[PDB]
Amino acid sequence: LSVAGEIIGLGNVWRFPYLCYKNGGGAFLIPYVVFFICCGIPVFFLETALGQFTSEGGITCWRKVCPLFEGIGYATQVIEAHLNVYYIIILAWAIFYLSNCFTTELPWATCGHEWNTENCVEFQKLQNATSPVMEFWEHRVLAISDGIEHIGNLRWELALCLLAAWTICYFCVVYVTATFPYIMLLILLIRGVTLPGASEGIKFYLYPDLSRLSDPQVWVDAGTQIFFSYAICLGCLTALGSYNNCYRDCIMLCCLNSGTSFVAGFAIFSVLGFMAYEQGVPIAEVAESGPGLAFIAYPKAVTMMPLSPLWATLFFMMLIFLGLDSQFVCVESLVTAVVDMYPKVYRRELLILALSVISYFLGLVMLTEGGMYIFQLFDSYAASGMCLLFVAIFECICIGWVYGSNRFYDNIEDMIGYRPPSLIKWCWMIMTPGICAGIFIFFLIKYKPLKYNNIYTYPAWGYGIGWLMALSSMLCIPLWICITVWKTEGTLPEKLQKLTTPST
Numbered sequence: 001l002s003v004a005g006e007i008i009g010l011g012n013v014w015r016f017p018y019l020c021y022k023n024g025g026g027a028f029l030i031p032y033v034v035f036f037i038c039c040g041i042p043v044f045f046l047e048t049a050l051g052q053f054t055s056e057g058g059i060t061c062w063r064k065v066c067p068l069f070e071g072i073g074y075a076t077q078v079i080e081a082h083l084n085v086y087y088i089i090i091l092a093w094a095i096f097y098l099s100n101c102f103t104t105e106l107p108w109a110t111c112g113h114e115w116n117t118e119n120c121v122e123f124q125k126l127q128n129a130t131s132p133v134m135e136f137w138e139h140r141v142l143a144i145s146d147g148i149e150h151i152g153n154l155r156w157e158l159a160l161c162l163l164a165a166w167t168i169c170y171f172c173v174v175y176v177t178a179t180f181p182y183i184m185l186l187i188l189l190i191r192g193v194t195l196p197g198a199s200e201g202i203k204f205y206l207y208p209d210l211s212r213l214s215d216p217q218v219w220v221d222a223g224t225q226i227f228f229s230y231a232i233c234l235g236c237l238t239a240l241g242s243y244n245n246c247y248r249d250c251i252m253l254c255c256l257n258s259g260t261s262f263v264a265g266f267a268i269f270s271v272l273g274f275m276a277y278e279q280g281v282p283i284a285e286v287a288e289s290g291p292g293l294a295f296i297a298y299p300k301a302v303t304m305m306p307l308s309p310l311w312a313t314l315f316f317m318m319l320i321f322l323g324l325d326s327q328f329v330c331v332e333s334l335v336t337a338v339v340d341m342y343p344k345v346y347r348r349e350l351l352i353l354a355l356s357v358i359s360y361f362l363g364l365v366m367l368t369e370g371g372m373y374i375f376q377l378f379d380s381y382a383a384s385g386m387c388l389l390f391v392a393i394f395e396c397i398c399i400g401w402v403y404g405s406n407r408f409y410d411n412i413e414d415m416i417g418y419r420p421p422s423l424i425k426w427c428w429m430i431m432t433p434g435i436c437a438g439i440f441i442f443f444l445i446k447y448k449p450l451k452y453n454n455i456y457t458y459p460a461w462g463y464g465i466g467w468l469m470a471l472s473s474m475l476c477i478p479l480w481i482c483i484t485v486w487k488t489e490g491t492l493p494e495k496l497q498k499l500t501t502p503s504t
């Protein structure tokens with residue numbers, strides 16, 4: 001077919017504009033492109049080829065080729081387990097936004113309600129002036145607190161919204177369903193461009209500021225954005241696919257995702273220009289630098305359109321569909337992955353329920369009055385950050401050096417009929433492991449505290465929690481190496497020979 005439908009998700013329309021604005025905009029595109037061509041394509045091709053060659057799931061696929069490096073198989077599951085916990089919180093806010101839109105006038109368009117303070121200004125017909133949209137996002141949807149040290153009470157309204165999300169996916173495609181996001185994204189893009197003052201937002205988006213490139217954060221959260229959007233170190237090995245066009249896929253599939261992210265991001269910054277023009281405030285400080293950005297720019301565009309409620313209900317439906325089509329795959333893969341002993345057969349209907357309840361109660365802690373602060377730690381340390389950089393290094397080293405790139409190339413040529421260009425092999429051997437290690441060391445040397453919204457500075461134990469969350473997935477590989485060395489064959493090159501020959 002021509003429409004794969006596997007070229008979009010919440011990682012494209014929610015995360016990418018969030019990261020670009022936070023890092024300063026414009027200067028974020030240069031590290032993005034470097035990772036895109038030299039660490040985004042070769043690794044994706046390696047995952048797909050390795051998955052299809054063995055026709056076998058990731059946990060045992062590494063046993064087939066890299067018996068010493070089983071820690072890669074276990075590391076991806078821990079990252080996926082962390083991801084399922086906080087990837088559904090976004091659908092908690094989307095449902096809450098949707099429920100408020102089933103009325104004539106949108107509550108966030110106009111000020112003068114209980115949550116709005118005395119500083120509300122319509123700006124549609126100026127010191128310490130706030131837009132009504134930001135007040136709606138912060139005071140009632142989040143009810144932000146002073147800091148992480150105040151967890152506070154639990155938001156009851158958000159609690160049941162999360163319950164609904166889970167319930168719906170406990171039972172979790174037509175062409176119209178697949179092309180629904182693209183039509184809506186185009187409609188939103190048209191409205192933003194024609195808006196007055198959008199030229200500043202585009203100039204802010206494209207023209208880079210080379211002074212900020214020296215900051216280690218920009219490099220860390222660009223390549224990690226590439227890895228997160230592609231689902232590279234979260235389970236990507238596909239047994240299905242028969243004997244194919246694996247190389248031809250990335251020239252079409254694993255590159256067009258970046259185009260969608262770029263186009264979708266283009267729409268948001270057009271709206272941010274209009275708000276800056278209206279309020280007469282620099283684009284740098286016109287909005288919130290945290291995760292809650294797609295909930296401040298998109299509602300403004302939807303309330304600047306005729307028939308506002310009709311457009312309002314649909315876009316949140318698009319977000320709900322995007323989240324549902326992406327989390328059920330992960331929750332199915334993780335449950336299937338733990339089934340490798342098969343003690344007995346309602347096992348298929350018991351683990352699926354057991355996993356959901358644990359995730360619901362552990363996803364409930366970030367729905368309280370101090371939930372945004374803990375959500376920020378989850379987004380920066382678990383399922384991202386150093387966890388993806390570390391695993392990507394060990395993946396390319398084993399196949400590139402231990403197993404042998406030339407042997408793998410021969411198998412790929414056998415499978416598809418021709419040998420891919422030699423550039424990919426050099427990537428695997430030197431480029432990706434070197435760049436990832438360099439970024440790791442650069443970030444470690446110039447360690448600066450992470451700040452929420454560039455205002456709040458976390459306490460010591462917050463950074464400690466983040467570091468433990470990263471280590472919980474970063475420490476599976478050396479531990480397995482030590483265990484395998486100590487047990488089975490202990491010493492001498494005999495164990496070294498056994499721990500390198502692939503399974504026959």
Ligand SMILES: [Cl-]
Pocket residue numbers: 011012016225226229257258261
């Ligand atoms: Cl992306």
